[PDB]
Amino acid sequence: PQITLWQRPVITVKIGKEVREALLDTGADDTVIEEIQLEGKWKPKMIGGIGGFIKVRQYDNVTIDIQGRKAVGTVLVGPTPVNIIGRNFLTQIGATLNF
Amino acid sequence: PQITLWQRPVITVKIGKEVREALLDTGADDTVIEEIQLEGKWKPKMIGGIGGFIKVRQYDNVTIDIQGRKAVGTVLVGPTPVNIIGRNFLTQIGATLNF
Ligand SMILES: CC(C)CN(C[C@@H](O)[C@H](Cc1ccccc1)NC(=O)O[C@H]1CO[C@H]2OCC[C@H]21)S(=O)(=O)c1ccc(N)cc1
Ligand SMILES: [Cl-]
Numbered sequence A, B: 001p002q003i004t005l006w007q008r009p010v011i012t013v014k015i016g017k018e019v020r021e022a023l024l025d026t027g028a029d030d031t032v033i034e035e036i037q038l039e040g041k042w043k044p045k046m047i048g049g050i051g052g053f054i055k056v057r058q059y060d061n062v063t064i065d066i067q068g069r070k071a072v073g074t075v076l077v078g079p080t081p082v083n084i085i086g087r088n089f090l091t092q093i094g095a096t097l098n099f
Helices: A087-093 B087-093
Strands: A010-015 A018-024 A031-033 A042-049 A052-066 A069-077 A096-098 B010-015 B018-024 B031-033 B042-049 B052-066 B069-077 B096-098
Touching: A018 A031, A042 A069, A052 A087, A069 A087, B018 B031, B042 B069, B052 B087, B069 B087
Parallel strands: A031 A069, B031 B069
Antiparallel strands: A010 A018, A010 A052, A042 A052, A052 A069, A096 B096, B010 B018, B010 B052, B042 B052, B052 B069
16 A cells, blocks of 8 residues: 555554554665564674663564455564564565655 | 665654654654754643653744755654654655555
């Protein structure tokens, strides 16, 4: 779809076979979700945003389905204020910014 | 243009009287710049992100030029890690997120 930006671009997705809502975020390098258990081993990491750093659990090779588009990649789990889909998955579904 | 997301969508923009670079950020409601002299009156606000809150100065009615697309609107000035153009200006330049 073509998504205008008069409201936040929040979409329903499936992450690791769980339905979640998330913000499509071109300003995020990475995908960050709060309170989910995913497959495989995780690795601790730190990421920073506008207000400082948070600790996250990094899971690799997680499947995300965005309106029929499947991608597999890294998901960070930690106390983000809102769930975010970042560029690591937006590139895999061929998302672009257009003006 | 049609901008892919394999690298951060950083573009050059003119903000008030100053050329700056900034990140095109669909996950940001508002545009936030660090250390820019803007004219007019301002009001103090906080905004929050990953990691917590920062205190900004809110300036209304600032002119930005993005690749020839001119827009007027609110700019927040404060200690953001990187400059970001948020939806309040993305909508005004006709940007959409597509996939
Ligand atoms: C500031 C960006 C360079 C980075 N962020 C993405 C950004 O889109 C967040 C995404 C975001 C969105 C909501 C809440 C927290 C974070 N937006 C944000 O902080 O926007 C602020 C300015 O406008 C306001 O509207 C939203 C909060 C304010 S980030 O959330 O900190 C971030 C950092 C690292 C990764 N991997 C993923 C995301
Ligand atoms: Cl700059």
